[PDB]
Amino acid sequence: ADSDINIKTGTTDIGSNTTVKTGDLVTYDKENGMHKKVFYSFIDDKNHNKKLLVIRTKGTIAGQYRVYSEEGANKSGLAWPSAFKVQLQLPDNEVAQISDYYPRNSIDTKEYMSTLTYGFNGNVTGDDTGKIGGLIGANVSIGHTLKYVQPDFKTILESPTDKKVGWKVIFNNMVNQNWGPYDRDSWNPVYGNQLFMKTRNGSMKAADNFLDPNKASSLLSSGFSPDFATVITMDRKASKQQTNIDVIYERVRDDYQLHWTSTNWKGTNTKDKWTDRSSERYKIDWEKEEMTN
| CA angle in degrees (0–180, nearest 5) for 161-166-170 | 135
* Dist. CA 160–CA 165, nearest whole Å: 4
Q: Which of 109, 203, 239, 262 binds a second copy (CB under 8 A)?
A: 109
Using CB under 8 A, count the residues that bind a second copy: 131
Q: What are phi and psi of 4, to 5 degrees?
A: -85, -10
Judged by CB under 8 A, the stretch of 16-24, 202-210, 238-246, 278-286 that binds a second copy is 16-24
| Nearest to a second copy of 21, 240 (CB atom) | 21
| Nearest to a second copy of 117, 239 (CB atom) | 117
* Dist. CA 138–CA 143, nearest whole Å: 17
C-alpha pair distances (Å), 183 with each of 7, 24, 34, 222, 289: 48, 38, 26, 20, 47
Q: Which of 32, 176, 186, 222 binds a second copy (CB under 8 A)?
A: 222
Q: Binders of a second copy among 236-275, rule CB under 8 A?
A: none
Shortest CB 279 distance to a second copy, Å: 18
| Nearest to a second copy of 154, 273 (CB atom) | 154
- The residues, ordered by sequence, that sit 6+ positions from 65 with a Cβ below 8 Å of its Cβ are 78, 79, 80, 81, 213, 216, 220, 221
Paired sense of beta strands 79-89 and 265-276, if any: unpaired
Residue 220: which H helix or E strand, with range?
helix 218-221
Judged by CB under 8 A, the stretch of 100-108, 243-251, 252-260, 276-284 that binds a second copy is 100-108
Judged by CB under 8 A, the stretch of 72-80, 111-119, 258-266, 276-284 that binds a second copy is 111-119
Q: Which of 71, 74, 91, 105 binds a second copy (CB under 8 A)?
A: 105
Closest-CA residue to 188 (of 180, 79, 35): 180
Q: Binders of a second copy among 31-90, rule CB under 8 A?
A: 33, 35, 37, 39, 41, 43, 45, 47-50, 52, 54, 56, 58, 60, 62-63
Contact 277, 248 (CB under 8 A): yes
Q: Binders of a second copy among 158-197, rule CB under 8 A?
A: 158-163, 170, 172, 175, 178-181, 185
Does position 6 interact with a second copy (CB under 8 A)? The reply is: yes
| Nearest to a second copy of 124, 262 (CB atom) | 124
| Nearest to a second copy of 125, 263 (CB atom) | 125
Contact 37, 26 (CB under 8 A): yes
